[PDB]
Paper text:
The tri-longin domain (TLD) RabGEF complexes represent a family of [name] with a unique conserved structural core. In each complex, two subunits that contain three longin domains (LD1 to LD3) each form a heterodimer, which is required for catalytic activity toward the cognate Rab GTPases. We here report the cryo-EM structures of the [name]-[name] and Inturned-Fuzzy core complexes bound to their cognate GTPases [name] and Rab23 in the nucleotide exchange transition states, revealing a conserved catalytic mechanism with distinct modes of substrate recognition. Thus, TLD [name] rely on both conservation and variability in the switch 1 regions of their substrates to realize catalytic efficiency and specificity.
[name]-[name] is a dimer in yeast and activates the Rab7 homolog [name]. To investigate potential interactions of Mon1NTD and Ypt7HVD with the TLD [name] core complex, we use full-length [name] and [name] in the current study. Analysis of purified complexes by cryo-EM revealed a mixture of dimeric CtMon1-[name] and trimeric CtMon1-[name]-[name] particles. The experimental map does not reveal unmodeled density that could be interpreted as the Mon1NTD or Ypt7HVD. Consequently, our structures do not provide support for models that suggest an autoinhibitory interaction of the NTD of [name] with the longin domains or recognition of the Ypt7HVD by [name]-[name] at the chosen conditions. The analysis of the electrostatic surface potential of [name]-[name] revealed a large basic patch on the Mon1LD2 located opposite of the [name] binding site that—together with an amphipathic helix in a disordered region of Ccz1LD2 (17)—mediates binding of [name]-[name] to model membranes. Here, the titration of CtMon1-[name] on the SLBs yielded an apparent dissociation constant KD of 67 nM. With respect to membrane recruitment, we observe a notable difference between the fungal [name]-[name] complexes, which strongly bind to charged lipids, and the metazoan [name]-Czz1-Bulli homologs, which only bind weakly. Also, while the electrostatic interactions of the fungal complexes are primarily mediated by the [name] subunit, metazoan complexes depend on Bulli/RMC1 for membrane association in vitro and functionality in animals.
Numbering used by the authors:
A (entry chain B): 11 to 54, 94 to 155, 181 to 359, 460 to 476, 490 to 501, 527 to 583, 598 to 624, 644 to 670, ...
B (entry chain A): 189 to 323, 333 to 457, 486 to 609, 612 to 664
Write the structure that this text describes.
């Protein structure tokens, strides 16, 4: 009867917000505990606040204390007996303090962190959540504060982070190796072929999606990726594919990024929001509801907008998103805020359905393209372009070539030795195992992460 | 070997901060040190600081005491925290808090082991009931702790591996040494032990009592790794605890130089009236050794350093290695003369030793990672030549090695296999698998 390693508390606090004694209470712009998060999970006092202020105050105390020792670097992680606390500076003056309780094994409890995400991975997940929050709200937390006001910022942070922490699993799950670099997770095919003669790699689909941004006004970027498989010609054709709250597969990822006009950091956030839509359809942020007329269109243009950064060779833009949904593909089309007026949306959607329906079968064939003692699982992460292409299988749910325990073990080794070599934001850190797993990590701007099996 | 990698302020890191310069830049110099060892009480008032004076470190230790007090009030003891390149590791031993602050890219396990060694030295000087009662506390132990912490900073393989070195004597000669060292048992000796320059030579043992490796490390870190045996060049009736043997038994140690590199004889007795008797030990030992000419053999074997890596393995590309037998819980290595050019000062050899030891430390962190069953770890630092290093952690032994960067994985894994074959070939010679009667 062990207790799962649920997170203890998570706090978003700006120290500069509260300077005087009576204004200390407004330092915590957000606070959440498991007791607080129980209601959010099931949907998806003075002494307590006294504990919260002491926690954030001693977090500030550690960063002030270690500022002199580290010569300008705050306390990244805190390792305790029953809480793997981390404190990440998401931006200048803004901090996320998240304490993750370890597995309590039986009230004398024995504490362990066999399957708890390593603090580098927890920091990566919190940074991903912060980037999603910035994607849906403003350009930065400081700008969001100085524009909206503290009450509005508190409300928006409360909603978004309650939803995220309700949906957040702090144990090892999915494919953390894709998640430890963050980055744009590409599909098995990776990307559509751009040049001529690569029609099997998706040259025609690439050309059509490239010319689409000029054919229709307001549209600046098209982001599409394969998530799942083609429709099953059976009774339940719906299959509830867009929800299921599951995990992205190793072959699931972006298949065509934008032409440009959008910074790669924002492209990472857009792809991550697209992954959230695939995992949490009808439940992700923004409440994406399928159009009753045609089920293809999700989160229609007829308001809701997301905040991105554009390429300098083309700046915050606040583009309006629309999510065209095919069964295996999730087209995210980012329109300008003012030019495609919603009054023409019912017609334009038809035009979209005119220009994206013939890109179902051919692009399905194109994405099927696939680019060594027993098995080789390599992870190529281009640092400059943030693209991540991983053949490493994800951790199975509670047939797959892996089992759960072997997946946990080898996968925990992978990002642990990545953290040892400072891979996270020649170096051939080859590592062998007793089970026959042969990791070869090399630094090329590629973070190559080959991993032979048996 | 590759020069000027990683840290760059270690040439003066062991140099103590002077007291002449004002306290501002004094604290700046203290915080600029790569490694810190601090011992504080339950109330957090400063007990011991490796580098700075107690008044200088009072504010820092007060801040960390407030942190630890809040965590103890929160029922969650702290195990350490990382700030980028620096790492703080705190170990909770009774009323005492031991904190190690490392900028040398060291894991939690190694810092915990070093703090545990410091705690073992404290427990050996002051018995556990007295340690609880003190909550003065470090009378005479401050210099020993400072020197042992300096040995940790320079890179101590014995504390890294939690094992000891050996003299590498022939099995026949070592058996003869043990036989002679036991023929004078005197029916009074509890733990017999003989060392030549920090390398264990021979051990005699009672039938029931067993000489635990923790007691060996405690003795060696008291005497040789700390170098506190120096200066007391004579008859030393040093009190002792040996918590592994018993945490309340206040045992006694006989230390005397074999000057009749510097061979030392360590004899453990439970009676304080036995020193004279143990005196009758030493002469009856020494003359016997001087009768056999063996003491000259020990002196010559200790005088020549670790065997040369080329002499150990002919035509090898390896520059250094570090073998360790787990069942024998003892280790060995090649000489460090090959690491540095033949004309080398103390600073160059010191930097080379620290750098090699940091390579071994990061490899040991790689192998000994909890929730990570890594058998062999290989790494290659660029050094814009290069450097390559492998660590093998089979249940039978543990090997670390260093080669130039232009070897490749297999080209030096073959050398790892060869040095394993050499070590198991001379397992009797390189290690003391047993002991006395």
């Amino acid at each position: 009867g062990i207790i799962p390693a649920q997170l203890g508390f998570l706090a978003i606090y700006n120290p500069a917000l509260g300077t005087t004694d009576e204004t200390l209470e407004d330092q915590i712009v957000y606070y959440a505990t498991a007791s607080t998060l129980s209601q959010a999970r099931r949907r998806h006092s003075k002494e307590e606040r006294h504990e919260r202020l002491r926690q954030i105050g001693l977090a500030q105390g550690m960063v002030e204390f270690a500022k002199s020792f580290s010569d300008g670097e705050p306390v990244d992680t805190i390792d305790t007996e029953k809480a793997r606390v981390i404190l990440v500076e998401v931006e200048e003056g803004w901090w996320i303090l998240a304490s993750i309780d370890l597995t309590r094994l039986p009230p004398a409890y024995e504490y362990s962190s066999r399957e708890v995400k390593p603090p580098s991975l927890l920091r990566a997940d919190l940074l991903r959540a912060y980037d999603l929050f910035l994607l849906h709200h403003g350009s930065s937390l400081s700008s969001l504060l100085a524009s909206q006001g503290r009450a509005q910022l508190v409300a928006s942070l409360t909603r978004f982070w309650d939803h995220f922490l309700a949906t957040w699993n702090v144990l090892l799950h999915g494919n953390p190796a894709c998640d430890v670099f963050g980055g744009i997770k590409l599909a098995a095919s990776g990307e559509l072929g751009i040049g001529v003669g690569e029609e099997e790699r998706g040259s025609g689909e690439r050309e059509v999606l490239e010319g689409l941004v000029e054919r229709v006004e307001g549209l600046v970027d098209v982001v599409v990726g394969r998530y799942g498989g083609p429709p099953s010609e059976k009774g339940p054709e719906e299959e509830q594919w867009l929800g299921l709250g599951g995990e992205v597969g190793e072959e699931d990822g972006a298949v065509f990024l934008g032409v440009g006009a959008l910074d790669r950091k924002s492209l990472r956030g857009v792809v991550q929001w697209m992954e959230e839509v695939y995992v949490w359809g009808e439940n992700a942020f923004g409440k994406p509801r399928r159009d009753l007329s045609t089920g293809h269109f999700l989160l229609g243009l007829s308001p809701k907008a997301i905040f991105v950064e554009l390429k300098p060779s083309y700046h915050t833009a606040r583009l309006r998103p629309v999510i065209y949904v095919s069964q295996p593909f999730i087209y995210i089309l980012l329109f300008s805020e003012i030019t495609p007026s919603p009054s023409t949306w019912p017609t334009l959607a038809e035009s979209l359905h005119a220009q994206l329906s013939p890109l179902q079968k051919p692009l399905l064939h194109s994405t099927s393209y696939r680019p060594t003692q027993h098995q080789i699982f390599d992870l190529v992460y281009d640092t400059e372009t943030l693209t991540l292409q991983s053949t490493i299988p994800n951790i199975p749910d509670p047939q797959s070539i892996w089992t759960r325990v072997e997946a946990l073990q080898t996968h925990a080794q992978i990002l642990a030795i990545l953290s040892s070599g400072r891979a996270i934001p020649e170096g051939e850190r080859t590592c062998k195992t007793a089970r026959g797993w042969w990791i070869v990590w090399t630094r090329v701007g590629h973070l190559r992460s080959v991993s032979s099996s048996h | 070997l590759g020069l000027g990698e990683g840290m760059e302020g270690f040439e003066r890191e062991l140099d103590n901060i002077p007291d002449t310069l004002p306290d501002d830049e004094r604290l700046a110099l203290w915080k600029g040190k790569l490694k810190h060892y601090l011992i504080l009480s339950s109330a957090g008032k400063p007990i011991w600081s490796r580098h700075g004076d107690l008044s200088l470190v009072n504010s820092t230790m007060g801040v960390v005491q407030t942190i630890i007090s809040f965590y103890e009030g929160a029922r969650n003891p702290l195990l350490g925290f990382t700030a980028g390149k620096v790492r703080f590791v705190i170990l909770i031993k009774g009323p005492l808090y031991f904190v190690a602050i490392s900028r040398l890219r060291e894991s939690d396990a190694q810092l915990r082991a070093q703090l545990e060694a410091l705690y073992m030295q404290i427990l050996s000087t002051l018995t556990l009931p007295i340690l609880t009662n003190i909550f003065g506390p470090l009378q005479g132990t401050e210099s020993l702790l400072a020197s042992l912490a300096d040995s940790f900073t320079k890179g101590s393989p014995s504390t890294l591996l939690s094992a000891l070195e050996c003299l590498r004597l022939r099995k026949s000669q070592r058996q003869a040494i043990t036989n002679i060292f036991l023929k004078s048992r005197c029916e009074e000796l509890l733990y017999g032990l003989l060392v030549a320059g920090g390398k264990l030579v021979s051990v005699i043992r009672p039938r029931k009592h067993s000489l635990h490796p923790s007691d060996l490390q405690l003795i060696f870190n008291m005497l040789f790794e700390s170098g506190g045996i120096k200066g007391n060049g004579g008859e030393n009736w040093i009190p002792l605890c040996l918590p592994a043997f018993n945490n309340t038994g206040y045992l006694y140690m006989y230390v005397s130089f074999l000057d009749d590199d510097l061979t030392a004889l360590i004899l453990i007795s439970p009676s304080r009236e036995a020193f004279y008797a143990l005196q009758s030990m030493r002469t009856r030992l020494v003359s016997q050794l001087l009768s056999t000419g063996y003491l000259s053999l020990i002196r010559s074997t200790a005088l020549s350093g670790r065997p040369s890596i080329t002499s150990i393995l002919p035509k090898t590309p390896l520059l250094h290695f570090l073998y360790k037998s787990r069942p024998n819980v003892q280790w060995c290595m090649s000489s460090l003369s090959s690491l540095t050019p033949p004309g080398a000062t103390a600073t160059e050899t010191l930097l080379a030793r620290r750098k090699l030891m940091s390579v071994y430390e990061e490899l040991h962190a790689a192998l000994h990672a909890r929730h990570a069953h890594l058998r062999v770890v290989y790494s290659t630092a660029d050094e814009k030549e290069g450097l390559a290093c492998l660590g093998w952690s089979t249940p039978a032994f543990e090997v670390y090695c260093v080669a130039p960067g232009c070897v490749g994985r297999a080209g030096m894994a073959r050398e790892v296999n060869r040095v394993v074959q050499w070590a198991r070939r001379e397992e009797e010679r390189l290690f003391i698998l047993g002991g006395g009667v």
